[PDB]
Design an enzyme around this catalytic site. Structure first.
Site, PDB file in Angstrom:
ATOM      1  N   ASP C  44       0.831  -1.199   0.000  1.00 51.70           N
ATOM      2  CA  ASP C  44       0.000   0.000   0.000  1.00 51.70           C
ATOM      3  C   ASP C  44       0.868   1.252   0.000  1.00 51.70           C
ATOM      4  O   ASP C  44       0.529   2.252  -0.633  1.00 51.70           O
ATOM      5  CB  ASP C  44      -0.942   0.009   1.206  1.00 51.70           C
ATOM      6  N   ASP C 147      -1.866  14.984  20.718  1.00 50.27           N
ATOM      7  CA  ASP C 147      -0.818  14.685  19.750  1.00 50.27           C
ATOM      8  C   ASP C 147      -1.126  15.305  18.390  1.00 50.27           C
ATOM      9  O   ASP C 147      -0.257  15.920  17.773  1.00 50.27           O
ATOM     10  CB  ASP C 147      -0.625  13.174  19.618  1.00 50.27           C
ATOM     11  N   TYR C 160      -4.528   4.269   8.990  1.00 56.85           N
ATOM     12  CA  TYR C 160      -4.228   4.944  10.250  1.00 56.85           C
ATOM     13  C   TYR C 160      -5.496   5.236  11.042  1.00 56.85           C
ATOM     14  O   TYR C 160      -5.495   5.203  12.272  1.00 56.85           O
ATOM     15  CB  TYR C 160      -3.481   6.253   9.985  1.00 56.85           C
ATOM     16  N   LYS C 162      -8.226   3.491  11.445  1.00 56.37           N
ATOM     17  CA  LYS C 162      -8.684   2.367  12.253  1.00 56.37           C
ATOM     18  C   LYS C 162      -7.840   2.203  13.512  1.00 56.37           C
ATOM     19  O   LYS C 162      -8.359   1.883  14.582  1.00 56.37           O
ATOM     20  CB  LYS C 162      -8.664   1.070  11.444  1.00 56.37           C
ATOM     21  N   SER C 163      -6.537   2.427  13.379  1.00 58.85           N
ATOM     22  CA  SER C 163      -5.621   2.285  14.502  1.00 58.85           C
ATOM     23  C   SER C 163      -5.886   3.347  15.561  1.00 58.85           C
ATOM     24  O   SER C 163      -5.620   3.138  16.745  1.00 58.85           O
ATOM     25  CB  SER C 163      -4.170   2.369  14.023  1.00 58.85           C
ATOM     26  N   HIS C 220       2.043   9.629   2.975  1.00 61.99           N
ATOM     27  CA  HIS C 220       3.356   9.121   3.366  1.00 61.99           C
ATOM     28  C   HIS C 220       4.429  10.197   3.494  1.00 61.99           C
ATOM     29  O   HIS C 220       5.513   9.932   4.014  1.00 61.99           O
ATOM     30  CB  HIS C 220       3.825   8.065   2.362  1.00 61.99           C
TER      31      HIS C 220
HETATM   32  C1  5AG Z   1       0.321  17.811  29.087  1.00 55.46           C
HETATM   33  C2  5AG Z   1       0.910  17.718  28.074  1.00 55.46           C
HETATM   34  C3  5AG Z   1       1.653  17.616  26.855  1.00 55.46           C
HETATM   35  C4  5AG Z   1       2.974  18.014  26.883  1.00 55.46           C
HETATM   36  C5  5AG Z   1       3.750  17.934  25.750  1.00 55.46           C
HETATM   37  C6  5AG Z   1       3.197  17.454  24.581  1.00 55.46           C
HETATM   38  C7  5AG Z   1       1.880  17.064  24.548  1.00 55.46           C
HETATM   39  C8  5AG Z   1       1.346  16.555  23.240  1.00 55.46           C
HETATM   40  C9  5AG Z   1       2.403  15.693  22.552  1.00 55.46           C
HETATM   41  N1  5AG Z   1       2.853  14.673  23.507  1.00 55.46           N
HETATM   42  C10 5AG Z   1       3.939  13.950  23.331  1.00 55.46           C
HETATM   43  O1  5AG Z   1       4.648  14.013  22.337  1.00 55.46           O
HETATM   44  C11 5AG Z   1       4.235  12.982  24.460  1.00 55.46           C
HETATM   45  S1  5AG Z   1       4.124  13.714  26.123  1.00 55.46           S
HETATM   46  C12 5AG Z   1       2.457  13.780  26.328  1.00 55.46           C
HETATM   47  N2  5AG Z   1       1.606  13.663  25.346  1.00 55.46           N
HETATM   48  C13 5AG Z   1       0.409  13.759  25.892  1.00 55.46           C
HETATM   49  C14 5AG Z   1      -0.837  13.699  25.339  1.00 55.46           C
HETATM   50  N3  5AG Z   1      -0.924  13.521  24.045  1.00 55.46           N
HETATM   51  N4  5AG Z   1      -1.943  13.820  26.145  1.00 55.46           N
HETATM   52  C15 5AG Z   1      -1.741  14.004  27.509  1.00 55.46           C
HETATM   53  N5  5AG Z   1      -0.528  14.061  28.018  1.00 55.46           N
HETATM   54  C16 5AG Z   1       0.553  13.937  27.246  1.00 55.46           C
HETATM   55  N6  5AG Z   1       1.852  13.934  27.483  1.00 55.46           N
HETATM   56  C17 5AG Z   1       2.525  14.111  28.734  1.00 55.46           C
HETATM   57  O2  5AG Z   1       3.566  14.929  28.274  1.00 55.46           O
HETATM   58  C18 5AG Z   1       4.496  14.831  29.333  1.00 55.46           C
HETATM   59  C19 5AG Z   1       5.854  15.418  29.037  1.00 55.46           C
HETATM   60  N7  5AG Z   1       6.043  16.517  29.969  1.00 55.46           N
HETATM   61  N8  5AG Z   1       5.515  17.671  29.695  1.00 55.46           N
HETATM   62  N9  5AG Z   1       4.996  18.825  29.423  1.00 55.46           N
HETATM   63  C20 5AG Z   1       4.703  13.349  29.393  1.00 55.46           C
HETATM   64  O3  5AG Z   1       5.209  13.027  30.679  1.00 55.46           O
HETATM   65  C21 5AG Z   1       3.268  12.874  29.227  1.00 55.46           C
HETATM   66  O4  5AG Z   1       2.795  12.539  30.509  1.00 55.46           O
HETATM   67  C22 5AG Z   1       1.091  17.134  25.680  1.00 55.46           C
HETATM   68  C1  5AG Z   2       1.563   0.075  10.498  1.00 56.30           C
HETATM   69  C2  5AG Z   2       2.216   1.018  10.367  1.00 56.30           C
HETATM   70  C3  5AG Z   2       3.016   2.162  10.230  1.00 56.30           C
HETATM   71  C4  5AG Z   2       3.461   2.532   8.997  1.00 56.30           C
HETATM   72  C5  5AG Z   2       4.242   3.642   8.853  1.00 56.30           C
HETATM   73  C6  5AG Z   2       4.565   4.364   9.958  1.00 56.30           C
HETATM   74  C7  5AG Z   2       4.122   3.989  11.190  1.00 56.30           C
HETATM   75  C8  5AG Z   2       4.481   4.812  12.379  1.00 56.30           C
HETATM   76  C9  5AG Z   2       3.700   6.119  12.480  1.00 56.30           C
HETATM   77  N1  5AG Z   2       2.689   6.282  11.434  1.00 56.30           N
HETATM   78  C10 5AG Z   2       2.346   7.466  11.025  1.00 56.30           C
HETATM   79  O1  5AG Z   2       2.815   8.472  11.493  1.00 56.30           O
HETATM   80  C11 5AG Z   2       1.318   7.588   9.944  1.00 56.30           C
HETATM   81  S1  5AG Z   2       1.408   6.386   8.616  1.00 56.30           S
HETATM   82  C12 5AG Z   2       0.624   5.212   9.396  1.00 56.30           C
HETATM   83  N2  5AG Z   2       0.771   5.013  10.645  1.00 56.30           N
HETATM   84  C13 5AG Z   2       0.002   4.023  10.928  1.00 56.30           C
HETATM   85  C14 5AG Z   2      -0.216   3.399  12.095  1.00 56.30           C
HETATM   86  N3  5AG Z   2       0.433   3.823  13.135  1.00 56.30           N
HETATM   87  N4  5AG Z   2      -1.093   2.377  12.132  1.00 56.30           N
HETATM   88  C15 5AG Z   2      -1.711   2.020  10.976  1.00 56.30           C
HETATM   89  N5  5AG Z   2      -1.488   2.634   9.865  1.00 56.30           N
HETATM   90  C16 5AG Z   2      -0.642   3.626   9.814  1.00 56.30           C
HETATM   91  N6  5AG Z   2      -0.224   4.398   8.860  1.00 56.30           N
HETATM   92  C17 5AG Z   2      -0.638   4.391   7.491  1.00 56.30           C
HETATM   93  O2  5AG Z   2       0.530   4.486   6.783  1.00 56.30           O
HETATM   94  C18 5AG Z   2       0.193   5.205   5.646  1.00 56.30           C
HETATM   95  C19 5AG Z   2       1.463   5.764   5.035  1.00 56.30           C
HETATM   96  N7  5AG Z   2       2.509   4.762   4.874  1.00 56.30           N
HETATM   97  N8  5AG Z   2       2.204   3.536   4.659  1.00 56.30           N
HETATM   98  N9  5AG Z   2       1.895   2.271   4.444  1.00 56.30           N
HETATM   99  C20 5AG Z   2      -0.502   6.383   6.231  1.00 56.30           C
HETATM  100  O3  5AG Z   2      -1.476   6.824   5.354  1.00 56.30           O
HETATM  101  C21 5AG Z   2      -1.261   5.766   7.337  1.00 56.30           C
HETATM  102  O4  5AG Z   2      -2.580   5.676   6.912  1.00 56.30           O
HETATM  103  C22 5AG Z   2       3.344   2.888  11.336  1.00 56.30           C
END
Ligand code: 5AG
Ligand code: 5AG
Ligand code: 5AG
Ligand code: 5AG
EC number: 2.7.1.23
Lengths: 263, 262, 260, 245
Positions: C44, C147, C160, C162-163, C220
């Site tokens: 794919d 995120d 992606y 579905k995941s 991609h």
């Molecule tokens: C609060 C917050 C925060 C801080 C930084 C970045 C983000 C979004 C992107 N997150 C990441 O890349 C991994 S860190 C993270 N993501 C998530 C997330 N999506 N929803 C909840 N909380 C997260 N943590 C918390 O971020 C903390 C990093 N410290 N700070 N600020 C980690 O310890 C996680 O507990 C969210």
């Molecule tokens: C399996 C797998 C996979 C393939 C490539 C990269 C990664 C790590 C992070 N993925 C992404 O940032 C987005 S690409 C992607 N991730 C995901 C994902 N975690 N689980 C399902 N499927 C994904 N797609 C599918 O990969 C397609 C691109 N490359 N391929 N095949 C994208 O359109 C997504 O729909 C995981």
């Protein structure tokens, strides 16, 4: 006794810092950022994480205290306008010590040697380019072959953080365990994952073993470095615990309630 | 010593049952279905649940053992073609005892206590609206189908289907999961499953309705004029008879991921 | 007619490639500039490359995917069926199925950059937190923090989407689905949680809050966009065309991927 | 040729008479529902054979609904304006065939123990389900039970139907898709029993006990419900004001 204070960076935190150091001058409190017994974090949870890793070698002799200058945090429970009473209680020595479990992250290479890490919130492992494919081995037994973004092993106190957003369960910090959550798993006939979050007790080891790629992005408490030529990533509940200085009673579930529901 | 065996009801379970009683006649095993020391369940997990509630008063002297006549269960770990080895091992008295935590369900209005091996759910009779109180402190107001408080061993049951987390039975705790909760401007729920340790009490209190259907492991009773439903980790524990090593995570693996040797 | 073939990179795809190219030596001229039939051999991910390689001439190309590895949703035909494909592609005996696409528009502080997605288009941060305001049809819906966000195509729902816990949509439906990526659902950033499916002529605009540097990923390719003022999502008027020969139902293809 | 249905309370009955002053309950063309969404469903099922000739209007005496869009104390202007948006519907067939029409959705659970069926999509087996039940939802009904079950919210301008799982065990023997499934028009989802054939079939919570069931078919109905549009209340705003405050 020997204390110290870390500040967020803003004027509000730096201002409160000096006033507390002064306050601690009226008593038998010695400011020491090399061998402290009480580390006070002023700012937020992110600031608290920095103060934790700043003294991860001296966790056994340090009781941490968090003060939030902004919104209420899960580590920073003290309000700025309560620092006076905090100083007095911290001078008499009138406080008990509550401990939270920690996560030990061990990464192995193609033997340079062995790298151990300590997590307060959680430790995640993603890829470095394309797909993230590893084999989850629980207690020397294969469990599943994962394919997706990555995996997230969370601490009990870290369940209210990244773990919750990933669909993990909220565990009380009095429970010595660790929780494994999936990050965008494809979950198909080839890579069949459990889907459900997994809570592992003490002395249980979750070993992540590579399949086709050995370059992973390992993040511990949002410190994210690139580990090349990885052979094994082990997760287990560390024997080391972080210690908090308890003065009043701020229940975990109320702190969850005031954060996610309403204050 | 004093043992007994429960059967599912079909011929497969009934046939295998008698064959074990016979084998156990060759040893110093006294057959007693009133005061046993070892209870053997033959059938499935539902059959095992029946064996638990049939003798939940004498949990202190009973080591349970499960045999699955169909697919692998989380309580019925022994295969039928291993029944020969079970009597031999269970006659010598050579076994270790593993204990799993239980859930205590208390209903107040005559106060009624119940013990759960898997989990306990509370639904309505129209809409289900209750107040979740954690340790005498308000947490949230629930609105949906119901709530599910699960045991660590019961996490692999209804709990897993509701999107709950899988907890290892070595952990003394309980898990609360939501059942199709609406999340709008009036009823903001936590959404995430909640894991409570020992001595933590989760009290469900009614709002504008007092008729709920309380379900405890394979049961379902109608409780009228309910004022409070209290949840806490019971001091009572269920005991299992260990001979070999069948890890909890393997039974999770063989159930949901694959079983390549079957 | 005017055709071409792209290869994954492994030996299996390049070998199968040459064996099919010979086969056509019918009235089939190999042309990589103005083809009428593009065949992708690999997976794919390989198919996505072939799509973006010819996203400018989509109306004259009928795509065909061949998977040398595991079954894909775009590479649905097995290698040991490449024999009959050559004959069937020679008579011109085939019907044309079309799948919807996603239009991604980015605005800056300059012009504006438009992108075409076969699977989906995601917007994440570049460092810390990802905080944006989701605006549906010039109307505020929610303030997101986590995120990132994922706007998926119907055919890309099985990827992606579905995941991330998204719903599976049939490609006959002209729509788009928005899913959340680890959103912090608290008192300040209350998100809908549920995936959102938007119809045609509906515009979902992502607008920054405190940061204007985002990592925008389309299918991609994932590049870092600085000084972003607005990111608009809508169902594109352009459609990808497939050359259908036999009958491989979409739900059957979903069955073969996730259920068996 | 209009009519008004009431919830049952005095407030709705009072508002009813006041609008009547401003009538055929046999051949209506304009149906006004006063009460809530649950009340609105009753007005819908009362006239499902002539949906093609009826334009519905909902008035909420209680909280804001997705069907009851009009405010009670502003109903004064309504009589003058009433002197057309269409939403898709769900067709439920039980196997002598029994047909049902759903405004929200149609769900099927068990009647005792386990609920085990085989999901057949377009005369082809897809999965063998085991759990509480299954929920086939309409686009307008996605904001109801469908959302609580983890389903996606789709805009009512899309002619489709969404199937969501209800507490599936999803194991190696009963492998379910997990993700919600959206089917377009002319797509038929056939639910077929294994052992037990007595299930609780629910349409808009009109739960009847069907014995000896052989097949339950789901498909996007050709009939659509019509609303009388006067102002402009976008669907996503109605979702926004409900869940996002
Ligand atoms: C609060 C917050 C925060 C801080 C930084 C970045 C983000 C979004 C992107 N997150 C990441 O890349 C991994 S860190 C993270 N993501 C998530 C997330 N999506 N929803 C909840 N909380 C997260 N943590 C918390 O971020 C903390 C990093 N410290 N700070 N600020 C980690 O310890 C996680 O507990 C969210
Ligand atoms: C399996 C797998 C996979 C393939 C490539 C990269 C990664 C790590 C992070 N993925 C992404 O940032 C987005 S690409 C992607 N991730 C995901 C994902 N975690 N689980 C399902 N499927 C994904 N797609 C599918 O990969 C397609 C691109 N490359 N391929 N095949 C994208 O359109 C997504 O729909 C995981
Ligand atoms: C067994 C069984 C079973 C399987 C499917 C459906 C049902 C009826 C709908 N569920 C209930 O009424 C609650 S019991 C239950 N439901 C579920 C569920 N949907 N998915 C997984 N497992 C469940 N349990 C487990 O069955 C155990 C055995 N009870 N029975 N029969 C109960 O304790 C639950 O833990 C019962
Ligand atoms: C709040 C609530 C509520 C409403 C009805 C019933 C219940 C308790 C057990 N669940 C049911 O009886 C399923 S019916 C149902 N539950 C739900 C649901 N939790 N959140 C959204 N919507 C639902 N529908 C929908 O409401 C309408 C049923 N009538 N009413 N009200 C039907 O269209 C259903 O599709 C709780």
């Amino acid at each position: 006794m020997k204390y110290m204070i870390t500040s967020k960076g803003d004027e509000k935190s730096d201002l409160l810092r000096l006033n507390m150091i002064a306050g601690f001058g009226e008593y038998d409190m010695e400011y020491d950022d090399v061998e402290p017994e009480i580390v006070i974090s002023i700012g937020g949870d992110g600031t608290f994480l920095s103060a934790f890793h700043q003294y991860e070698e001296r966790l056994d002799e340090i009781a941490f205290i968090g003060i939030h200058t902004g919104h209420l945090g899960f580590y920073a429970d003290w309000r700025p306008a309560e620092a006076d009473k905090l100083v007095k209680l911290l001078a008499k020595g009138e406080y008990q010590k509550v401990s939270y479990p920690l996560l030990k992250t061990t990464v192995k290479y193609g033997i340079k040697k062995e790298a151990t890490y300590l997590a307060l919130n959680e430790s995640t492992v993603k890829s470095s380019g394309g797909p993230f494919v590893v084999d989850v081995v629980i207690n020397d037994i294969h469990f599943e072959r994962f394919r997706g973004d990555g995996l997230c092993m969370s601490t009990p106190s870290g369940t209210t953080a990244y773990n919750k957003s990933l669909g993990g369960a909220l565990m009380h910090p009095s429970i010595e365990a660790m929780q494994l959550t999936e990050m965008a798993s494809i979950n198909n006939r080839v890579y069949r994952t459990i889907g459900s979050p997994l809570v592992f007790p003490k002395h249980h080891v979750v070993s992540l073993q590579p399949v086709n790629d050995k370059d992973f992005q390992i993040s511990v408490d949002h410190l994210s470095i690139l580990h090349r030529d990885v052979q094994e990533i082990r997760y287990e509940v560390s024997a080391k615990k972080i210690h908090f200085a308890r003065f009043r009673s701020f229940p975990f579930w109320r702190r969850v309630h005031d954060s996610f529901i309403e204050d």
